[PDB]
Design a protein around this nucleic acid. Structure first.
Ligand SMILES: [Mg+2]
Ligand SMILES: [Zn+2]
Ligand SMILES: [Zn+2]
Ligand SMILES: [Zn+2]
Lengths: 45, 1425, 49, 59, 107, 183, 98, 49
DNA sequence: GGTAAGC
RNA sequence: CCCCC
DNA sequence: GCTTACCTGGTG
């Protein structure tokens, strides 16, 4: 067999607004998720 | 110039003494103590505090208040203050040097670890250069890890003498961030060495010891690399950006200093108080951090001292670091006043050297004129006009310093001017101004023009001047700079004026010609068919400004007087202009209206086009610049355009699709042509597909097939191309431009009307990007013209979708390269300039740099200016010895070989004259001696070389001047000629000196010119060919003398930059890729930009190393000889001949398990070991190619393993070629070990590193017995890999002729002289392969610079920039800050002899107009009254 | 005539530019250059949805 | 075969009468084009004389 | 002049500078097989006398520093057995002038 | 029209050929400084304001804004604002130094916070001139070189005159055949 | 290009469930020496198992998508030479209509 | 005979910019690349609002 | 992200 | 950025 | 023989 074509278009992905937004929303939610854990640790109630 | 009179004497900087501040000096030069982190607010009161951001160090508030000095903003340099550091701290810049100094001195007593008692040390202490000496002392002392009390005495090695006791063991110092950690010697004593500890032993280093290290007793003691008292820079260095009252943003430095301060107050508090000692170490290291991070905030040790914003804090070091840096961005280049920029537009009605300046710009830009009795009235009127009318003025500068603003001054209407006042008036018509087009790659990118104030918003320029600028009118912008002195404007007009730049010294040819409309129209105007009638003839004549007012007699008189185009264009050509040409079928009665003949500025025959009126070396332009001067020439551009342009405005010219539409039957021809080639392709396909296609030396059946295909399709594009181009009439507008030379070529006609042709990506036809197909529209395994990118249609017919895509694939190719190359091509340009900057021609004709080191003893080896050099033919060199003798030999003593009495009056009485024959015998003997010598210099016989003084033209002009009668005898004598030429040679002066060195140097410089001179003024030639008169011949000698002298270089020539730019500009145009040898591997070359880098970088690991081995004389024609030499050279391993190797369990040595090996046993037996058999089979073909036999191979294995292995083998004629091996706990696995080393590293035949050798049949030009140069081909071995050393001593080669692209390897084997010779060959070959031409002297100079140091000095930061040249100059390229620190620590002295140093200091450089001084002579000043 | 497909952030219209990347979960074989001791490499850049 | 193998690569080059040499003045010219300038201006055309062996350029 | 086959032992190589004013030169037999001075690219290098050198420096108004340099280990410097300081006159063919002479100071 | 430039019919230019509109919108906000310390949109006057711009404040209405329809030139004040840093400071906006035109639209609104927000659009007509860039759809870019009126222009017997004159030299090397076929 | 689009990202599970029903043997159950010929079935670069008659499965998949039952964006390729069947549910694939 | 698919229109291989060029199949490749980039420096009507 | 001259 | 040979 | 430390076109 011959070496893989590292430049074949079929092996390429174009990340649009959707996945790009999905990337932020995941880190942003997980940042709020751990911030909620700060409130729960500080909790005397 | 820094405002208001100073009584102090004004002087220039002659020397810069670099050093380091003693802490004592910082305190001595301080104005304020500095002690509060707080910057301002007197508690809250907005005004600066007694601590930071000064009392005292300067001012703010644009309120004078600068401490007693009390000078105010512009006038006040700031004043430094200090901060006393609570604990000493290392300076970042010197951390490494400190390590190295500690590594050289005993960490206890401060003594040097080595001394005079050590022989190696004595050798180092002898080193003159401090930098090299410290490097040596360190390399020695670093390993010394005890401070010896006693060492062996100079005489007795058994006895010892006390040196300087102590005897303490030294640590092994490692740098831990900003800390220095030692390891003395159970397990080692690890400890961090304190700053105080280091400082102390540095303070204890002997003067003699620190002077032996790079240091200076006065200017830079090593102890000063440790900081103790920090200088606080004044506000001008760290300005507080005020956002209007009670809002001010301090500089990053101001903030950093506050942190240093805060860290320091902290440490001082703990030190004084109850020091917890492990808290003290923290505040100490923090102080260290800030002090480090203030100067350099880009340390390897990651934490990057950030601003509370997340920004990283601008280190002082960061402000200086190049391009935008202080040096590069503010000193080498500046943003400047008296400048302008707009869109450039073209103008046929402007003289070559004028520049159309928009009024708005003219009214803005202002030249400052001094009120003199000559201008008093004129300037008075411009002042009255004010700043708003065109001939106007903006300001009036009084005796009393301050300037009057004419737009506001209540007195602006009044103002009675006085002598000496300056009037700042608007830029006006004829003011010399510097016009520029970026990127400024040449001297011609910037030229001086005369203003012409005009309406509309564009700078208008003459079309001819477009080419030097490399400008077009598709919205290009150009720059204008206004000179302000009567002195700088003379520099512009007398040195940089557009007409002075006509002939470029880069290419040694003119760099401006006739273009576009005028070039097209000039061909059209000058055909036989073109006649003009009175009406227009008059307007045409009236258009030439210089016209004599005389109506020329029409060519046709008869019942309709008609003038020919040629006839009237001749009016634009000045009188006394002679030019002869001869193109293809050209006779004196030119039938095609070919070539060119101009007699006394009147066209006799031929059409005028790119050849006559372009920027050709013998073109009407060149001849006019040379024969009449730049000003007459510049006038000529103007005149030719004014006439031709007018005629064209009236004739017209166009282009349409009609001009692309090639004939019906021609289209049939073109279609069957493409289909015919397509057939050949299919045939070569079916041949290849049926395994019948034959190999090709240019290997691979596949590579071979593609060659045939590619060629067939190229022959097709070009055959169809011609068919069309041939079928278009002489009326075809496209052809009419192609003919004039104005636009387009044959390719353009072929592609537009016949066939586009084959598309190429990476030098190969469109690849299978998909699996076995170029597009999904095709089948798999399709090698058809169509599938692999052949566009068969013309742009006129249109492209098919596939063709469209493949054309796009190959289109993109160029655009990628240009995008990639751009930075690499740029940085090469800079390095060349920075390396050659300081090279200039001195008043002794020598070529020297800033240090005054000789680079060339005479500029470009001849001492001539490249603008005065023209390719001339050295006749004597070629032809038969017989024809030479015919042409030159004069024998008065022989009836048949005397001079004919028809040739000279003396002819009848000269026959038999023995006394004159002795003279003609000298003449001929020298001419022969010359021919012999020329054939030594130029080995190939090449006759055409660029030399000063075009002798062809001088004789030609003498003949047209004196009306030479080629049918009358000459009044010349043989003595007149023989002795005449001899005396002329004595006056062709390049050098002057009344000593043998200079007189010999002079004789030498003129050697090649005199060869030409003697060859062109031989007695036989002068009389029988030129037919000169004494008067005529005298005029010739006279002119040669004058012209030669005009040709010598001018002391002051900035020859360095010139050469850098002459190699730089063509480099700019080379390609990264090229792939001209793609589709043929086992033939690889580095070329273009990559090879230019390999060269300039003196790259050690080059991509294509190669020996070119020439064969021993009488064996160069024998192919079989060369094959044997190939076998002797190419590195042949055992692996190279082996088919396979096997391991068997063959337990009986007497009887083999393998039935094949039966015969091998019966031999190596007929006349305790190992049962494990290593058996390897060899390839007969492999073995036979390298002239090898079983015995030779076996014996090599027998010697590589000695008595460890048992080797037996098959003899040379047995069907299978085999070698059987046996060894002498385990056994098995150590045989796999033996087979690995066996294959991988056993040399059979050949030289190592030479991995592949090929035979070539190079054609060679050599003289025949008959004398004529003849093509005598020879066999040549071309290698793959280098070992010049071994291949040279190989029998049967010509070791006098051997060569490598690896000049670095030539340098090593043959010496620096041969190294330089090879390097030139290499430099030349990169530029020239690209088609490009650079005059020798430029490349000569670069190669010389890279070579004068004894070895190869790269045009890199490591190479030239590490030389003995002045600090400031070297810091201007690459290692800016690092250079300056080293300059300080080693107390460097810059003599400001270099350009860069005078630029940084804003002083006139010793360059061109600065290469001498100007003095008033009171003696003559009196005599003139 | 407006096409949409953009965002309004603090008044300005923002385009999220399509970012080309190498696909994940794909097996790729590459020959490693002569200076390296490793002859060839089998690579997989694997990430889950 | 080994003597055939030992000989190095040749490379023919397709020639045109259209262009004429400078030095030898011969119409045995072998060109090639390349996009050296911006996409605004045209290609370059690098000509080689397959006769004398001389190289040149175009606009 | 010592012409050795393979190598001169470091023990023996120590004795080389031990007898001044006499100078010892070591050349490998293999190095001497071909005379590099005979090469196409190698021009005539001429050893200058102390007086000829004095004049060269005088005539061009030079510091020894300002002269182009030749390495001591240079194949041609070794061939002429050039000592440090010795200047060599180099006569090369020029495509510009006919002949051109350079000078190199052996350092 | 040599070396990538072109001749344009001045008559055509008069009759409206290639004329364009140019708009530029200037924005400003009343800044809030914690406790009531807020900027104001007003026509300031040298009577305690003391850091005013050089251009005319005279075009502004008492609300510190220009009425649309007004002509504006040079570095004239188009938006008037003060900063209460203490009495007043100038915060006014001059029309871009190198510009001129007519105030087209002025909008007084509110930012999400609740502060006065102002946007000011300025309109100008740009007419084809000598240095002006033009291009066809074939990478055939160029500037105007000169502009001739109808009489000086070449003419067909039909009385038709060109609007533009491009150079024959543009065509052969560029091989812009599509341009010719378009035409 | 004017008609290109980018795959949004579908769920692979209904295709995985469909495949195994259509004759795809689990990767645990595979015996290389008992069927080396067998076509390796790949979904989003995950080897799921093998198929004995890949020609039929390929047609049953293509017609199922053409009908609408498998999202038109899901890509399916059969490499006869390497004995592989690649299925992409994957988001970010540039595709065109034909 | 083996055809599986047919192209809808080959002119659909071009983008938005190169779609505006008249007869782009009658031009030298880089002319089309150059005009693609240029229409961005143009002006007409971007929206009716 | 490429080359070389440091340890 | 957005433009250039 | 590996790790570090330098660099990377021009205007606006
Ligand atoms: Mg341009
Ligand atoms: Zn002061
Ligand atoms: Zn000691
Ligand atoms: Zn030729």
């Amino acid at each position: 067999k011959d070496q893989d074509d590292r430049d074949h278009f079929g092996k390429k992905r174009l990340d649009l607004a959707g996945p790009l937004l999905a990337q932020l929303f995941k880190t942003l939610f997980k940042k709020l998720t751990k911030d909620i854990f700060r409130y729960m640790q500080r909790t005397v109630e | 110039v820094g405002q208001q009179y100073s009584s102090a004497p004004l002087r220039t900087v002659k020397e810069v003494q670099f050093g380091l501040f003693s802490p004592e000096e910082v305190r001595a030069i301080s104005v304020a103590k500095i002690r509060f982190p707080e910057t301002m607010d007197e508690t809250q009161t907005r005004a600066k505090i007694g601590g930071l951001n000064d009392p005292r160090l300067g001012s703010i508030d644009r309120n004078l208040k600068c401490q007693t000095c009390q000078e105010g903003m512009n006038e006040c340099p700031g004043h430094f203050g200090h901060i006393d550091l609570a604990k000493p701290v290392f300076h970042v810049g010197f951390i490494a040097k400190i390590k190295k100094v500690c590594e050289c001195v005993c960490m206890h007593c401060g003594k040097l670890l080595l001394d005079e008692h050590n022989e190696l040390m004595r050798q180092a202490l002898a080193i003159k250069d401090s930098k090299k000496r410290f490097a040596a002392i360190w390399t020695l002392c670093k390993t010394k890890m005890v401070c010896e009390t006693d060492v062996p005495s100079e005489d007795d090695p058994t006895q010892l003498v006390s040196r300087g006791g102590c005897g303490n063991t030294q640590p092994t110092i490692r740098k831990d961030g900003l800390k220095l950690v030692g390891s003395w010697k159970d397990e080692p004593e690890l400890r961090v060495l304190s700053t105080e500890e280091i400082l102390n032993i540095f303070k204890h280093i002997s003067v003699k010891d620190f002077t032996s290290l790079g240091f200076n007793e006065v200017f830079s003691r090593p102890e000063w690399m440790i900081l103790t008292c920090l200088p606080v820079p004044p506000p001008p260095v760290r300005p507080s950006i005020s956002f209007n009252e009670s809002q001010r943003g301090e500089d990053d430095l101001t903030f950093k200093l506050a942190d240093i301060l805060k860290a320091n107050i902290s440490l001082e508090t703990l030190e004084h108080n109850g020091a917890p000692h492990h808290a003290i170490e923290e505040a100490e290291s923090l102080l260290q951090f800030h002090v480090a991070t203030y100067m350099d905030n880009d340390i390897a040790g990651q934490p990057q001292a950030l601003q509370k914003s997340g920004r990283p804090v601008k280190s002082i070091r960061a402000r200086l670091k190049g391009k935008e840096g202080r040096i590069r961005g503010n000193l080498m280049g500046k943003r400047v006043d008296f400048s302008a920029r707009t869109v450039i537009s073209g103008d046929p009605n402007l003289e070559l050297d004028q520049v159309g300046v928009p009024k708005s710009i003219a009214k803005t830009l202002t030249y400052p004129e001094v009120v003199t009795p000559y201008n008093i009235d004129r300037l008075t009127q411009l002042v009255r006009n004010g700043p708003n009318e065109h001939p106007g003025a903006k300001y009036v500068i009084r005796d009393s310093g301050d300037r009057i603003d004419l737009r506001y001054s209540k007195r602006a209407g009044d103002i009675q001017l006085q002598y000496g006042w300056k009037v700042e008036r608007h830029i006006m018509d004829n003011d010399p101004v510097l016009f520029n087009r970026q990127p400024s790659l040449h001297k011609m990118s910037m030229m001086a023009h005369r203003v012409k104030v005009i309406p509309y918003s564009t700078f208008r320029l003459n079309l001819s001047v477009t080419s030097p600028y490399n400008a077009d009118f598709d919205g290009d912008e150009m720059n204008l700079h206004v000179p302000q002195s009567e002195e700088t404007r003379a520099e512009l007009s007398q040195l940089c004026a557009v007409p002075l730049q006509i002939v470029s010294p880069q290419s040694n040819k003119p760099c401006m010609g006739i273009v576009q409309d005028t070039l097209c129209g000039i061909r059209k105007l000058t055909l036989r068919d073109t006649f003009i009638e009175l009406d227009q003839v008059l307007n045409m004549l009236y258009w030439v400004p210089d016209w004599d007012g005389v109506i020329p007699t029409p060519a046709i008189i008869k019942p309709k007087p008609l003038w020919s185009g040629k006839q009237i264009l001749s009016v634009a050509i000045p009188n006394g202009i002679h030019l002869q040409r001869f193109d293809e079928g050209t006779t004196l009665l030119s039938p095609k209206d070919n070539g060119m003949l101009i007699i006394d500025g009147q066209i006799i025959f031929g059409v005028v086009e790119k050849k006559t009126v372009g920027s050709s070396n013998g073109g009407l332009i060149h001849v006019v610049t040379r024969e009449k001067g730049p000003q007459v020439c510049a006038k000529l551009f103007g005149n030719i355009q004014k006439v031709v342009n007018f005629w064209l405005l009236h004739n017209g010219f166009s282009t349409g699709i009609g001009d692309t539409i090639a004939d019906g039957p021609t289209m049939r021809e073109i279609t069957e042509t493409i289909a015919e080639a397509k057939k050949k392709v299919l045939d070569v396909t079916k041949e290849a597909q049926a395994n019948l296609l034959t190999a090709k030396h240019g290997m691979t059946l596949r590579e071979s097939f593609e060659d045939n295909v590619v060629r067939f399709l190229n022959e097709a594009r070009d055959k169809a191309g011609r068919l069309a181009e041939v079928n278009l009439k002489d009326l075809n507008n496209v052809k009419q431009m192609v003919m004039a030379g104005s636009k387009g070529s044959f390719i353009n006609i072929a592609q537009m009307s016949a066939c586009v042709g084959q598309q190429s990506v990476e030098g190969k036809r469109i690849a299978f990007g998909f699996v076995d197909r170029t597009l999904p529209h095709f089948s798999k395994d399709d090698y058809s013209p169509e599938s692999k990118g052949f566009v068969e249609n013309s742009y006129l017919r249109g492209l098919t979708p596939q063709e469209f895509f493949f054309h796009a694939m190959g289109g993109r190719e160029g655009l990628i390269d240009t995008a990639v190359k751009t930075a690499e091509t740029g940085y090469i340009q800079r390095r060349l300039v920075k390396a050659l900057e300081d090279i200039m021609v001195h008043y002794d004709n020598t070529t020297r740099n800033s240090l005054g080191n000789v680079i060339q003893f005479i500029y470009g080896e001849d001492g001539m200016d490249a603008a005065h050099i023209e390719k001339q033919s050295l006749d004597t060199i070629g032809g038969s010895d017989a024809a030479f003798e015919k042409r030159y030999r004069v024998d008065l003593l022989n009836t048949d070989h005397t001079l004919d009495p028809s040739l000279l009056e003396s002819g009848s009485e000269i026959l038999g004259d023995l006394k004159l024959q002795v003279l003609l015998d000298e003449e001929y003997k020298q001419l022969v001696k010359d021919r012999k010598f020329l054939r030594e210099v130029f080995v190939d016989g090449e006759a055409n070389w660029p030399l000063p003084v075009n002798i062809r033209r001088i004789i030609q002009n003498a003949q047209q001047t004196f009306h030479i009668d080629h049918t009358k005898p000459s009044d010349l004598t043989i003595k007149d000629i023989v002795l005449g030429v001899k005396d002329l040679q004595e006056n062709l002066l390049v050098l002057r000196g009344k000593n043998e060195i200079i007189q010999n140097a002079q004789r030498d410089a003129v050697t090649l010119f005199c060869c030409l001179l003697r060859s062109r003024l031989a007695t036989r030639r002068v009389l029988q060919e030129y037919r000169l008169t004494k008067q005529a011949f005298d005029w010739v000698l006279s002119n040669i003398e004058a012209q030669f002298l005009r040709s010598v270089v001018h002391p002051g020539e900035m020859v360095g930059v010139l050469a850098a730019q002459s190699i730089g500009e063509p480099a700019t145009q080379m390609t990264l890729n090229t792939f001209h040898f793609a589709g043929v591997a086992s033939k690889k070359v580095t070329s273009g930009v990559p090879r230019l880098k390999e060269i300039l970088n003196v790259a050690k690991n080059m991509k294509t190393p190669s020996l070119t081995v020439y064969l021993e004389p009488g064996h160069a024609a024998d192919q079989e000889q060369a094959k044997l030499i190939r076998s002797a050279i190419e590195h042949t391993t055992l692996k190279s001949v082996t088919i396979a190797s096997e391991i068997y369990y063959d337990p009986d040595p007497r009887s083999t398990v393998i039935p094949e090996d039966e015969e091998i046993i019966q031999l190596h037996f007929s006349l305790q070991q190992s049962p494990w058999l290593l058996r390897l089979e060899l390839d007969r073909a492999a073995m036979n190619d390298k002239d090898l036999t079983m015995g030779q191979v076996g014996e090599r294995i027998k010697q590589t393993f000695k008595n460890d292995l048992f080797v037996i083998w098959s003899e040379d004629n047995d069907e299978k070629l085999i070698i059987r091996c046996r060894v002498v706990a385990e056994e098995d696995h150590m045989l796999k070990k033996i087979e690995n080393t066996m294959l991988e590293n056993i040399t059979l035949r050949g030289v190592e590193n030479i991995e592949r050798v090929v035979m070539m049949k190079y054609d060679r030009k050599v003289p025949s017995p008959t004398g004529e140069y003849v093509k005598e081909p020879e066999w040549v071995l071309e290698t793959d890999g280098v070992n010049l050393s071994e291949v040279m001593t190989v029998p049967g080669i010509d070791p006098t002729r051997i060569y490598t692209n690896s000049f670095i390897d030539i340098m090593e084997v043959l010496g620096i002289e041969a190294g330089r010779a090879a390097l030139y060959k290499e430099v030349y070959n990169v530029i020239a392969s690209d088609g490009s031409y650079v005059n020798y002297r430029h490349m000569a100079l670069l190669v010389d610079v890279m070579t004068t140091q004894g070895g190869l000095t790269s045009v890199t930061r490591h190479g030239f920039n590490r030389s003995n040249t002045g600090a400031l100059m070297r810091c201007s390229f690459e290692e800016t800050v690092e250079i300056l620190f080293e300059a300080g620590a080693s107390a460097e002295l810059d003599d400001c002899r270099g350009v860069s140093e005078n630029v940084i200091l804003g002083q006139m450089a010793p360059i061109g107009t600065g290469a001498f001084d100007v003095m008033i002579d009171e003696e003559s000043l009196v005599k003139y009254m | 005539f407006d096409m949409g497909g953009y965002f309004i952030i603090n008044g300005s219209e923002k385009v999220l530019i399509a970012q080309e990347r190498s696909a994940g979960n794909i097996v790729q074989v590459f020959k490693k250059a002569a200076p390296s001791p490793i002859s060839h490499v089998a690579e997989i850049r694997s990430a889950l949805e | 075969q080994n003597l055939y193998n030992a000989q190095g690569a040749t490379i023919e080059r397709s020639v045109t009468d259209r262009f004429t040499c400078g030095k030898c003045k011969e119409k045995k010219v072998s060109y090639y084009q390349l996009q050296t300038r911006s996409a605004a201006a045209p290609l370059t055309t690098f000509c080689t004389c397959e006769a004398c062996g001389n190289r040149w350029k175009f606009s | 002049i010592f012409v050795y086959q393979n190598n001169i032992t470091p023990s023996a190589m120590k004795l080389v500078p031990s007898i001044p004013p006499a100078t010892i030169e070591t050349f490998n037999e293999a190095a001497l097989v071909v005379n590099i001075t005979h090469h196409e690219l190698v021009p005539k290098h001429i050893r200058l006398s102390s007086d000829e050198k004095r004049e060269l420096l005088k005539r061009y108004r030079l510091k020894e520093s300002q002269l182009p340099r030749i390495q001591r280990a240079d194949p041609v410097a070794l061939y002429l057995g050039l000592k440090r300081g010795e200047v060599v006159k180099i006569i090369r063919k020029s495509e510009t002038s006919g002949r051109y002479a350079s000078y190199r100071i052996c350092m | 029209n040599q070396e990538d430039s072109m001749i344009m019919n001045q008559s055509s230019i008069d009759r409206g050929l290639f004329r364009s509109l140019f708009f530029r919108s200037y924005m400003d906000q009343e800044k809030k400084y914690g406790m009531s310390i807020t900027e104001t949109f007003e026509k300031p006057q040298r009577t305690n304001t003391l850091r005013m711009k050089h251009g005319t404040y005279d075009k502004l209405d008492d609300d510190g804004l220009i009425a649309p329809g007004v002509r504006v030139s040079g570095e004239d004040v188009i938006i008037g604002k003060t900063t209460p840093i203490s009495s007043k400071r100038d915060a006014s906006t001059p029309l871009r130094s190198t510009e001129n035109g007519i105030v087209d639209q002025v909008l007084v609104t509110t930012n999400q916070d609740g502060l006065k927000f102002v946007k000011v659009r300025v309109r100008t007509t740009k007419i084809p001139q000598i240095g002006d860039k033009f291009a066809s759809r074939h990478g055939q870019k160029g500037t105007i070189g000169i502009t001739y009126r109808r009489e000086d222009m070449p003419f067909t017997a039909e009385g038709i005159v060109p609007d533009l004159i491009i150079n024959p030299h543009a065509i052969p090397s560029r091989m812009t055949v599509a341009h010719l076929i378009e035409c | 290009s004017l008609m290109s689009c980018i795959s949004v990202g579908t769920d692979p599970m209904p295709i995985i469930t469909f495949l195994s029903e259509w004759g795809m043997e689990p990767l645990e159950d595979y015996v290389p020496h008992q069927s080396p010929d067998a076509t390796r079935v790949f979904v989003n670069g995950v080897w799921h198992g093998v198929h004995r008659n890949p020609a039929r499965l390929m047609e049953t998949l293509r017609t199922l998508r053409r009908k609408g039952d498998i999202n038109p964006e899901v890509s399916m390729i059969r490499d006869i030479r390497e004995k592989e069947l690649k299925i992409f549910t994957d988001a970010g694939r540039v595709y065109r209509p034909l | 005979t083996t055809f599986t698919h047919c192209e809808i229109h080959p002119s659909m291989i071009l983008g938005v910019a190169a779609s505006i060029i008249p007869f782009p199949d009658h031009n030298q490749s880089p002319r089309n690349t150059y005009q693609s980039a240029m229409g961005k420096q143009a002006m007409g009507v971007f929206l009716t609002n």
